[PDB]
């Protein structure tokens, strides 16, 4: 009844896996080879031709953020968004902030030496705004347990760690971002996340290859 | 109780005016001078320092798309989104598509001659995807009346007309985009929109100035 066209390394696909597992929704995972996209992927997502794509009752939903809100509305038990409209607006605001700022991380795989240090400091400032104004003193973006905002920021955990190792730069460190670094550790320790993350060695190999391609 | 920090020309501010007027919500409009931003604007929107900003009960909500969803959740009567989760996901999908593709219009105020023709054809293709896959044969993106998707695309009416005149290029024409061109005319004729749009001559003057700045 539920199919997920995805991948073993995409952080965007993992957002959907986490949301489905938090809802207890059974699904079939269909791994796509992006160098030879299936006929179903091209039919289901003609606008972007990207994964993930959720297919529910044969109807497709593309774009991880759109999929996450569809899951929250379709399986409302175990809520992943607050009930209060102002708190829901703040959650959407921070999700949107992450979506817009994800592009700033691209420079980490394009710049060298004294230019790469500049890109890293700019990414630290993006994360500092998120830490100070978004997370604050809460354990998670969702308070005492993870919500759609934590899920949307999950790419800043093992994927960002792999990016830092591939590029030879440090961004999310405890001295510079104490609360965000503690959050990243707490997020990765949540059993649902711990049991559903790519193997670090395989993820690092993938990131080194993406960096090689972008020079 | 409701304040809107805005402007007389911003299409993003007009999205919020339309949503508030469709809900029958009384509000005070506070026009911001972006060359000398008020202390309230900087306090209410420290992340982006942009308008619009809605202030409801003294609590601020920045980003037009976030504001629109807050208005829909706070004043649920006269709904501006469908009830079905799949239809709601499609609405969010197209709103997101417009938000990402709005950047492609920037090239219309940066390119010249045989390069500007290329930027215009790329923008026509963005609109053709929206027309074929989003609007289809419906009168409005919301069916028989306007919804948040029509509101999000309202910038493709008089603002885009002004951009076409300022740059000397044609993008949204009836021969090339028959259904989208009919939609744009129908949208502008909705009494709520007709009574709440900037004066075209003033909007054109503003667009000519933005183009002069971007060369
Ligand atoms: N907006 C879409 C994006 C999906 C997408 O790009 N899908 C790719 C495959 S996944 C991309 C990925 O491997 C990747 C990995 C890590 C990051 C990352 C991590 C941390 C910090 C910053 C960046 C970002 C992206 C695709 O189908 N591609 C189609 C094709 O290329 O043919 C969504 O939200 O679903
Ligand atoms: N993501 C924000 C954007 C808001 C924004 O950019 N605000 C500007 C003022 S408005 C921008 C505008 O005048 C404008 C006009 C027309 C278009 C347009 C029209 C049609 C087709 C394509 C593009 C796009 C933008 C600001 O505060 N600026 C802060 C500052 O510059 O100091 C939102 O959705 O609220």
Residues B46 and B151 in one domain: no
B80 lies in a domain? Answer: no
Structure letter (DSSP) for residue A135: I
Residues B100 and B177 in one domain: yes
Distance (Å, whole) CA A184 – CA A155: 10
Residues A98 and A59 in one domain: no
Question: Residue B209 maps to which CATH number?
Answer: 1.20.1050.10
Residues A13 and A119 in one domain: no
Ligand 1, residue A52: give the atom nearest the CA.
Answer: 35
Q: Does A129 touch chain B (CB under 8 A)?
A: yes
A58 torsion bin: left (phi>0), alpha (psi -120 to 50), beta (else): left
- Residue of B8, B12, B126 with the most ligand 2 atoms within 8 Å of its CB, for mutation: B12
Q: What is the resolution of this structure in A?
A: 1.6
- Determine the residue of chain A that is closest to B58 in CA distance: A86
Domain boundary among A44, A74, A104: A74
B155 lies in a domain? Answer: yes
* Residues from chain B contacting residue A59 (CB–CB below 8 Å): 86
Residues B186 and B109 in one domain: yes
Residues A150 and A199 in one domain: yes
Establish whether residue A34 lines the binding site of ligand 1, counting it when its CB lies within 6 angstroms of any ligand atom: yes
Q: Does A97 touch chain B (CB under 8 A)?
A: yes
**A26 to each of A10, A29, A32, A190, B31, how far by Cα in Å?**
20, 10, 19, 20, 51
Domain boundary among A11, A39, A74: A74
Residues B106 and B69 in one domain: no
| The total number of structural domains that make up chain A | 2
Domain boundary among B74, B102, B127: B74
Residues A65 and A170 in one domain: no
Residues A27 and A116 in one domain: no
Which numbered ligand comes closest to the C-alpha of B93?
1
B179 lies in a domain? Answer: yes
Q: Does A44 touch chain B (CB under 8 A)?
A: no
- Determine the residue of chain A that is closest to B100 in CA distance: A100
Establish whether residue A44 lines the binding site of ligand 1, counting it when its CB lies within 6 angstroms of any ligand atom: no
- Packing angle of the helix pair A64-74, A11-23 (nearest 10 deg): 0
Question: Residue B14 maps to which CATH number?
Answer: 3.40.30.10
A49 torsion bin: left (phi>0), alpha (psi -120 to 50), beta (else): left
A27 lies in a domain? Answer: yes
Residue A191 burial (10 A CB sphere; 0-12, 13-18, 19+): exposed
Structure letter (DSSP) for residue A197: S
**What six digits make up the tokens of A120?**
């890293």
CA angle A15, A17, A23 (to 5 degrees): 105
Residues A60 and A15 in one domain: yes
A80 lies in a domain? Answer: no
Distance (Å, whole) CA A60 – CA A37: 16
Residues A32 and A100 in one domain: no
Distance (Å, whole) CA B170 – CA A129: 41
For residues A143-166, one letter each, b for 16 or more C-beta atoms within 10 angstroms of the residue's C-beta and e for the rest, the string is: eeebbbbbbbbbbbbbbbbbbbeb
B89–A61 CB contact, under 8 Å: yes
A136 lies in a domain? Answer: yes
Q: Which range marks the domain in which residue B199 is found? A: 85-214
Distance (Å, whole) CA B5 – CA B32: 6
Starting at the edge strand found earlier in the chain, the sheet holding A59-62 runs: A28-31, A2-6, A53-56, A59-62
For this PDB entry, the determination method is X-ray
Q: Does B73 touch chain A (CB under 8 A)?
A: yes
* Residues from chain B contacting residue A74 (CB–CB below 8 Å): 85
For every residue of chain B, which 3-state class applies, written as one string?
A: CEEEEECCCCHHHHHHHHHHHHHCCCCEEEECCCCCCCHHHHHHCCCCCCCCEEEECCEEEECHHHHHHHHHHHCCCCCCCCCCHHHHHHHHHHHHHHHHHHHHHHHHHCCCHHHHHHHHHHHHHHHHHHHHHHHCCCCECCECCCCHHHHHHHHHCHHHHHHHHHHCCCCCCCCCCHHHHHHHHHHHHCHHHHCCCCCHHHHHHHHHHHHHHHC
Residues B67 and B90 in one domain: no
Q: Is A77 helix (H, G, I), strand (E, B) or coil?
A: coil
């Amino acid at each position: 009844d539920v199919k997920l066209h995805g991948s073993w390394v995409s952080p965007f696909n993992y957002r959907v896996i986490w949301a489905l597992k938090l809802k207890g929704v059974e699904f079939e995972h269909i791994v796509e080879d992006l160098t030879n996209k299936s006929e179903l992927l091209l039919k289901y997502n003609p606008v972007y031709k990207k994964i993930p794509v959720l297919v529910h009752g044969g109807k497709p939903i593309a774009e991880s953020l759109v999929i996450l809100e569809y899951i929250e509305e379709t399986w409302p038990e175990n809520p992943l968004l607050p009930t209060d409209p102002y708190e829901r607006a703040m959650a959407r605001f921070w999700i949107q902030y992450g979506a817009t700022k994800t592009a700033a991380f691209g420079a980490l795989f394009r710049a060298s030496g004294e230019e790469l240090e500049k890109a890293a400091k700019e990414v630290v400032e993006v994360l500092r705004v998120l830490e100070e104004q978004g997370l604050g003193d809460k354990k998670f973006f969702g308070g005492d347990s993870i919500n759609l905002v934590d899920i949307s920021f999950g790419l800043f955990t093992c994927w960002l760690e792999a990016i830092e190792e591939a590029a030879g730069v440090k961004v999310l460190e405890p001295s510079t971002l104490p609360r965000l670094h503690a959050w990243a550790q707490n997020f990765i320790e949540v059993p649902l996340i711990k049991e559903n993350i790519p193997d670090y060695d395989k993820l690092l190999l993938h990131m080194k290859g993406v960096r090689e391609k972008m020079m």
